[PDB]
Amino acid sequence: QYLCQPLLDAVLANIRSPVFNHSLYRTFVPAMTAIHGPPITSIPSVLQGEVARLDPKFLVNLDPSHCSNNGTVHLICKLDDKDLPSVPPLELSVPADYPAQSPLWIDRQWQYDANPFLQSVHRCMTSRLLQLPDKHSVTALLNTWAQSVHQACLSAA
Amino acid sequence: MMDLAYVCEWEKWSKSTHCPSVPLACAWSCRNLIAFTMDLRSDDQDLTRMIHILDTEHPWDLHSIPSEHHEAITCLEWDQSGSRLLSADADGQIKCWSMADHLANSWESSVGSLVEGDPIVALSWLHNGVKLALHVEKSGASSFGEKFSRVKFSPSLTLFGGKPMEGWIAVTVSGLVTVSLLKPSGQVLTSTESLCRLRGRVALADIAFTGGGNIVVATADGSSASPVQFYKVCVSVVSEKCRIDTEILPSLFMRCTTDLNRKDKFPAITHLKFLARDMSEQVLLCASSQTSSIVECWSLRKETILKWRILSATNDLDRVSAVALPKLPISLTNTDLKVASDTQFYPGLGLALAFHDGSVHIVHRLSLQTMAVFYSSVHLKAMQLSWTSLALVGIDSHGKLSVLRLSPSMGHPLEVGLALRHLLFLLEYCMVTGYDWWDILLHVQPSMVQSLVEKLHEEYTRQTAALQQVLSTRILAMKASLCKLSPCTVTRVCDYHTKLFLIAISSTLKSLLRPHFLNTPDKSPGDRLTEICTKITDVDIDKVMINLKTEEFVLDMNTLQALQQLLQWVGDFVLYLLASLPNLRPGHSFLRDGTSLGMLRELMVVIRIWGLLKPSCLPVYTATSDTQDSMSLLFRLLTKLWICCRDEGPASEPDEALVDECCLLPSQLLIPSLDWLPASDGLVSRLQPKQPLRLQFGRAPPKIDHLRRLHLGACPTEECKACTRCGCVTMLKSPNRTTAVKQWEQRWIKNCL
Ligand SMILES: [Zn+2]
């Protein structure tokens, strides 16, 4: 500001002119040249990474059915835990632009029915997924599945 | 030596799928401009309905015109002067494309004709009625008129005297012909008519002109077992439209079918051509079977009164896919064949043929005999030749373009003198006309550049006081282009082209001032000022100014401000030239030339007068001498340097006193800068013989406005225009138009030197 108002006034009163560059060059090239001399001489990566960094209790892979190589992918899950029994596969669908959103779980009510243990698992599952917050990931849901199975097994015996 | 110049291909254009084959077209204009279309079928139909415009000097950048056509484009034609393009396809839609703002990278159309549902099979422009004849025997006649002789055909549809009328004629798939004429304004007159009462399939058609203003149309059904009909057409504009009068001409029948040995072969006709447009006395036919083909020629010479006979027929040919005709107008007289045979001069005796292999043949015109065979190591679908026939362009069944070098010798060794005579005779043809010479530069060897330049220099002289007046710019430009190929003389080009500028800036100033009172009658102001300046050899500038009638050199004090940049450039050039004495330099040629120094000498007295009239327009010298007249100091040294060369053949060397006094000059006058205009970017200086070059799309393996001396920033803001040949860059829309030298700006709207 101070000591430089005339330059600001000159620049503002000169701007958006077709010959501004020519004027500036012709008025300021020679002294600068003389004083100093010459001038200077499919599947998104996030899903692949999160699958790579999951606990070896899970071996999730692509669904043999449904579409592929798109923004929305489908995965089928299997649980291999020595301390827990076998449960339905609990497949998932991943929408496009997975970060900053949440995946959804495809419920299969008839699969979990006809057994008190399996429907106890299912009601604990519904409770936990209602307890999960927004913007959650798939690893959190898988861990919730494992913990719900463990809690149901503990409650049974 | 038949050779390959360079192959151009485009990435991602290939790898098409589910694409049926479609015929293509190609067109070569007077300037080195190529207009074509290529089969792409890449994720859009319109890529197969675009017009590709290519410039041979810069093959890498291509222009695409998105034509609004609904079907496959059939034919493309250029005008007599390559300023407009005619395009037609199926379902009518004949369009006339015009150049936009005189830019070759922008096209727009506002004129067209349409017939609904009928594909067009033939299309042509109307004739202007001027042609020339070239005699190789008189190549040393030392007379431009003696070499290239006028033939005097007659023009078609002459109105209001000897000025022809422009338009086009088209023939559809059926027996239907349409004629369109263009008024001097934007008005267009269109008409349609039926050929004859016999309405049938017309698969092939051709159009030719005859002396007297008549059109010959040839129609072929294509069954090889039916006659080829010929009709005569006259066009007359009876006060409101163009009426067409048609009548029948004798027909012919195909050969190679009465041989009674094996006639089942060759069951279809595939090509019907006229041997040369405006030459309707020779017709070429080409029939083909699934495996082999036959090509024949017929004529209508006088022995019924008129009959068609057989001239030649080849032994056996493969499938024919492309045929191309010469464009050079050979005289074809009996006395010229012997002198064109003893000397290896074959620029107009060749017909180019392509087959379904990688083989391209050059066959003799009068008798169908093969003389040149080329193998590519695929087949060629569309191809064209040049006006000088030094090269041919070809499009294969892929995304590749090829340019092939055709030599007049065709492998036969020759001496230097015959080659020089051939090259100069070919260059004089482009000298008389407005055609370019890129294909001629494709063949000039670096070794014999100096001989060509000097011999062309004496060819320029000893003309009848009128050809020299209108060929100065062309004689300068041709040798400026020639001198850049030889590394021995590569440094002299800046001595030529810059010199050209010195005329222009001097030509617009002597005509810019109009005296308000005449003095010294029967003498132009430029001539009187030049003779006054060359009559007085006074050392300083104040004595000379007295006797030039300073009261007359008065302008409107508005164009004077616009001239400031030119005067500053003149002063900077004077300072640089004077400071170049103490030095093979880009400014060496002006030291030994007297006329240029003299003209630059009187160029400054007038600006001294103007500066004393108005001090703001004077060039801004940065001299470290406030009490010394810098421009008078420059004038003294310029006069001293001028007298040493104004003698008729001086052959003198400057004395040491001049050398030291110009040595002391930079201690007082700073040298700001200079810019060299001939930026080396052409492919002529980069190509090598028997070294094919493969270049891709968009690869192309201190910015100043060269027209008006205006400096731009580090990165320019507004878009500009670039010259093709010289390579100069200039602003597109000039900033000052209400107050500018209209005598200087109007000289570059169409073309640059
Ligand atoms: Zn130019």
Structure letter (DSSP) for residue B491: G
Q: How far apart are CA B714 and CA B710, in angstroms?
A: 13
Angle at the Cα of B280 from the Cα atoms of B277 and B281, rounded to 5 degrees: 135
- Rounded to a whole number, what is the distance in Å from the CA of B710 to chain A's nearest CA? 6
Lookup: tokens for A126: 């519904």
Report helix, strand or coil for B384.
strand
CB A21 to CB B670 under 8 A? no
* Interface check B448 vs A, CB under 8 A: no
CA separation (Å) from B403 to B6, B573, B723?
A: 6, 42, 23
β strands within B309-349, DSSP E: 309-313, 317-318, 320-324
Is residue B280 classed exposed, middle or buried when 0-12, 13-18 and 19+ CB atoms within 10 A define those classes?
A: buried
CB B670 to CB A26 under 8 A? no
Other CB atoms closer than 10 Å to residue B58's CB: what's the count? 14
- Rounded to a whole number, what is the distance in Å from the CA of B742 to chain A's nearest CA? 19
Which stretch of DSSP H or E encloses residue B534?
A: helix B525-535
Q: By the 8 A CB rule, do B417 and B425 touch? A: no
CA separation (Å) from B334 to B131, B311, B330, B342?
A: 20, 17, 11, 14
Tell me how far the alpha carbon of residue B94 is from its chain's centroid. 26
Which method, experimentally, gave rise to this model? cryo-EM
Lookup: tokens for B366: 């009068």
Query: Closest Cα to residue B445, out of B681, B686, B689?
Result: B689
CA dihedral B636, B638, B644, B648 (to 10 degrees): -130
Distance of CA B111 from the midpoint of ligand 1 (Å)? 30
Residues linked to residue B297 through DSSP beta bridges, in sequence order: B284, B312
Q: How far apart are CA B532 and CA B548, in angstroms?
A: 8
All residues at 6 or more sequence positions from B403 whose CB lies less than 8 Å from its CB, including other chains:
B4, B5, B6, B7, B8, B56, B391, B392, B393, B394
Angle at the Cα of B328 from the Cα atoms of B323 and B329, rounded to 5 degrees: 120
Q: How far apart are CA A23 and CA B640, in angstroms?
A: 36
How is B624-640 classified by DSSP, letter by letter?
S-SSS-HHHHHHHHHHH
All residues at 6 or more sequence positions from B457 whose CB lies less than 8 Å from its CB, including other chains:
B479
CA separation (Å) from A107 to A98, A115, B540?
A: 20, 17, 105
All residues at 6 or more sequence positions from B677 whose CB lies less than 8 Å from its CB, including other chains:
B494, B497, B498, B501, B706, B726, B727, B728
Nearest CA in chain B to A18: B735
Is residue B208 classed exposed, middle or buried when 0-12, 13-18 and 19+ CB atoms within 10 A define those classes?
A: buried
In chain A, helix, strand, coil percent, each to 5? Answer: 45, 10, 50
Nearest CA in chain A to B703: A22
The radius of gyration computed from the CA coordinates of chain B, to the nearest angstrom, equals 31
Report helix, strand or coil for B559.
helix
CB B717 to CB A22 under 8 A? no
Lookup: tokens for B47: 């890529």
- Rounded to a whole number, what is the distance in Å from the CA of A42 to chain B's nearest CA? 21
Q: How far apart are CA B444 and CA B440, in angstroms?
A: 7
CA separation (Å) from B491 to A147, B32, B475, B480, B494?
A: 85, 26, 18, 11, 7
Is residue B181 classed exposed, middle or buried when 0-12, 13-18 and 19+ CB atoms within 10 A define those classes?
A: buried
On the CB side of B165, how many CA atoms lie within 13 Å of its CA?
Answer: 24
CA separation (Å) from B509 to B424, B506, B615, B634?
A: 35, 5, 19, 21
CB A30 to CB B672 under 8 A? yes
CA separation (Å) from B611 to A12, B543, B687?
A: 32, 17, 51
Nearest CA in chain A to B713: A21
All residues at 6 or more sequence positions from B652 whose CB lies less than 8 Å from its CB, including other chains:
B644, B645
Reduce the secondary structure of B108-158 to three states and give it as a string: EEEEEECCCCCCEEEEEECCCCCCEEECCCCCCCCCHHHHEEECCCCCCCE
The type of residue at B145 is: G
Chosen from B669, B705, B709, B711 to mutate, greatest number of chain A CBs within 10 A? B711
Query: Closest Cα to residue B570, out of B631, B623, B495?
Result: B631
Q: How far apart are CA A89 and CA A80, in angstroms?
A: 11
Q: By the 8 A CB rule, do B231 and B220 touch? A: no
Lookup: tokens for B390: 């030094």
Other CB atoms closer than 10 Å to residue B351's CB: what's the count? 20
Residues linked to residue A75 through DSSP beta bridges, in sequence order: A62, A92
Distance of CA B83 from the midpoint of ligand 1 (Å)? 18
Can you say whether residue B283 is alpha, beta or left, with left for phi > 0 and alpha for psi between -120 and 50 degrees?
Answer: beta
Residues linked to residue B286 through DSSP beta bridges, in sequence order: B271, B295
Query: Closest Cα to residue B560, out of B604, B518, B509?
Result: B509
Residues linked to residue B125 through DSSP beta bridges, in sequence order: B168
CA separation (Å) from B538 to B533, B535, B541, B635?
A: 9, 9, 8, 10
Q: By the 8 A CB rule, do B582 and B662 touch? A: yes
Report helix, strand or coil for B380.
strand
CB A19 to CB B735 under 8 A? yes
On the CB side of A17, how many CA atoms lie within 13 Å of its CA?
Answer: 12
Residues linked to residue B554 through DSSP beta bridges, in sequence order: none
Chosen from A22, A25, A32 to mutate, greatest number of chain B CBs within 10 A? A22
Q: Which of residues 649-678 of B touch A (CB under 8 A)?
A: 670, 672
Which positions in chain A have a beta carbon within 8 angstroms of at least one beta carbon in chain B? 18-19, 21-22, 25-26, 30, 34
Which residue carries 């067409």 as its tokens? B244
* Interface check B702 vs A, CB under 8 A: no
Which residue carries 């059939």 as its tokens? B74
Which stretch of DSSP H or E encloses residue A146?
A: helix A138-156
CA separation (Å) from B290 to A133, B316, B321, B352, B381?
A: 74, 14, 12, 21, 16
Reduce the secondary structure of B75-88 to three states and give it as a string: EEEECCCCCEEEEE
CB B711 to CB A18 under 8 A? no
CA separation (Å) from B104 to B34, B55, B409?
A: 12, 9, 35
First CA to last CA distance, chain B: 33
Query: Closest Cα to residue A74, out of A149, A122, A138, A144?
Result: A138
Report helix, strand or coil for B667.
helix
Q: How far apart are CA B231 and CA B615, in angstroms?
A: 75
CA separation (Å) from B158 to B166, B169, B596?
A: 10, 16, 47
For residue B710, which residues of chain A lie inside 8 Å, CB to CB? 19, 22
Q: How far apart are CA A122 and CA A109, in angstroms?
A: 8
Q: By the 8 A CB rule, do B683 and B7 touch? A: no
CB A21 to CB B672 under 8 A? no
Tell me how far the alpha carbon of residue B708 is from its chain's centroid. 26
Which stretch of DSSP H or E encloses residue A52?
A: helix A45-52
On the CB side of B428, how many CA atoms lie within 13 Å of its CA?
Answer: 29
The type of residue at A117 is: F
Q: By the 8 A CB rule, do B28 and B16 touch? A: no
Q: By the 8 A CB rule, do A54 and A80 touch? A: no
Reduce the secondary structure of B212-225 to three states and give it as a string: CCEEEEEEECCCCC
Of residues A22, A30, A34, nearest to B710 (C-beta): A22
Q: How far apart are CA B420 and CA B451, in angstroms?
A: 8
Q: By the 8 A CB rule, do B611 and B620 touch? A: no
Distance of CA B725 from the midpoint of ligand 1 (Å)? 6
What sections of B245-313 are H helices per DSSP? none
Nearest CA in chain B to A16: B717
Of residues A18, A22, A34, nearest to B711 (C-beta): A22
Lookup: tokens for B614: 């108005």
Can you say whether residue B523 is alpha, beta or left, with left for phi > 0 and alpha for psi between -120 and 50 degrees?
Answer: beta
Q: How far apart are CA A46 and CA A67, in angstroms?
A: 19
* Interface check B738 vs A, CB under 8 A: no
On the CB side of B35, how many CA atoms lie within 13 Å of its CA?
Answer: 26
Q: By the 8 A CB rule, do B246 and B204 touch? A: no
